[PDB]
Amino acid sequence: FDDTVTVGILHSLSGTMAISESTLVDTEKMAIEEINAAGGVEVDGKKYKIDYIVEDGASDWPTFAEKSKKLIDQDSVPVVFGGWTSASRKAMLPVYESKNAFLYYPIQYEGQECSNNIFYTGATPNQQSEPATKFMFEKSPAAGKPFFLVGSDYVFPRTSNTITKEQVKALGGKVVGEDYLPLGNTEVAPIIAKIKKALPDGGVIINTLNGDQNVAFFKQIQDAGLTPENGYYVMSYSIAEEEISTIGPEFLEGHYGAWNYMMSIDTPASKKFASDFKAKYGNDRQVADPQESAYNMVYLWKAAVEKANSFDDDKVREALIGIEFDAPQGPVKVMPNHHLSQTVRIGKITKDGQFEILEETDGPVAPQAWNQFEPSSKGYACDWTDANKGEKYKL
Ligand SMILES: [Ca+2]
Ligand SMILES: [Ca+2]
Ligand SMILES: [Ca+2]
Ligand SMILES: [Ca+2]
């Protein structure tokens, strides 16, 4: 190596979100180690080793904003890989925008955003909850049954459920419940009683709980008899193979997810991701969509740097649009709206905590940041390649 570049990593390693975010740091570090082993990042004929600073967001959104300022100003990083909850991202967004910096954010979310200073590898709703909703209503064993929505009390679950309510109405179904718990809250018995009352003949439960309150939720719904055997099916948007392995797959068997990457994808690229992750971190370790999303961020950033011949975040962000990567999920591409074109999978959870893949799109789906079911965003798009279009413009 001729020089070094130091990037920022900002995730919850402690608190209620650690169950989800800790493995993202592991995965981002694996990508960095791979890139370094292959020669680093090439800029102006010089090979740069990638170093990193990890900051603990501690499941606390003001801390995410504070550590973002530290990484940008004190540490002079050219990108921060970070975030999970939309609460943490909304807290960080003014920091990256006011400092004209660059956050790369990997987690599935609600859309309704298109920051010039954020790029996104997590699913937008049309890459996750919209196909999942149609699947539950039309194809699942609870086809035609009513929907009950349960999530954490912040902007992702509330916005996701607003979209779901619009879509279920358009599909001709019914929503019979919508309830939120504060993030981390484990007092799930009252909502369980409501689900039993509202779905006396079984049905679909849409779960947007984030973090480790999912542990209490899945264990208590099983003890209450809200089980696939009794006609109750949960579709979850914010947990996958990692959290399932901590919870215990016996509590998730038979329930559903919708994701762009699943560990069970039967391709050399998917198997190599899993095998490499186990070799570095242990044979017990899972890979999953959040990790695949974060992995991709590092490789996409590296490609954009080499295309731009610069680490400057304005030049890298300009170069990043259009970049393609042969990812563990299949081919992905960074779009003019800064999001990622991705293949969509529907899965049913097995006794071992893997997904049985039941549906898969014919190639990747372009991300709709501005949601096309929600009346306020219908007809809008985002395109940062055209000065006359931009963050939010009418088609
Ligand atoms: Ca920890
Ligand atoms: Ca993704
Ligand atoms: Ca199959
Ligand atoms: Ca858009």
Author numbering: 37 to 431
Pull verbatim passages from the article behind this deposition.
Prochlorococcus marinus MIT 9313, a typical Cyanobacteria, contains an ABC-type transporter, UrtABCDE, which may account for the transport of urea. UrtABCDE consists of three parts: a substrate-binding protein (UrtA) located in the periplasm, two hydrophobic transmembrane domains (UrtB and UrtC), and two hydrophilic nucleotide-binding domains (UrtD and UrtE). UrtA possesses the typical structural characteristics of cluster B-Ⅱ extracellular substrate-binding proteins. It consists of two domains, an N-terminal domain (NTD) and a C-terminal domain (CTD), linked by a hinge region.
The crystal of UrtA/urea complex belongs to the P21 space group and was solved to 1.60 Å. The structure of UrtA/urea complex shows that each asymmetric unit contains one UrtA molecule. The electron density map of the UrtA/urea complex structure shows that a single urea molecule is tightly bound to the hinge region between the two domains, interacting mainly with the residues in the hinge. Compared to the other three types of UTs, UrtA exhibits a strong urea binding affinity, with a Kd of 141.3 ± 11.2 nM. The six hydrogen bonds formed between urea and Ser122, Gln144, Tyr190, and Asn246 constituted a stable binding plane. Mutation on any of these four amino acid residues resulted in a significant decrease or complete loss of the urea binding affinity. The effect of Trp120 on urea binding may be attributed to the formation of hydrogen bond between the side chain of Trp120 and Asn246, which stabilizes the position of Asn246, a key residue involved in urea binding. In the UrtA/urea structure, the binding pocket was present in a closed state, and no entrance was found. Thus, we proposed that apo UrtA without binding urea contains a urea entrance and will undergo a similar closing process as other cluster B-Ⅱ proteins. Consistent with other cluster B-Ⅱ proteins, the conformational change of UrtA without urea is like a “Venus Flytrap”. These results suggested that UrtA undergoes a similar process to the typical cluster B-Ⅱ proteins, in which a urea molecule enters the binding site through the entrance aside the hinge region and causes apo UrtA to close around the urea molecule.
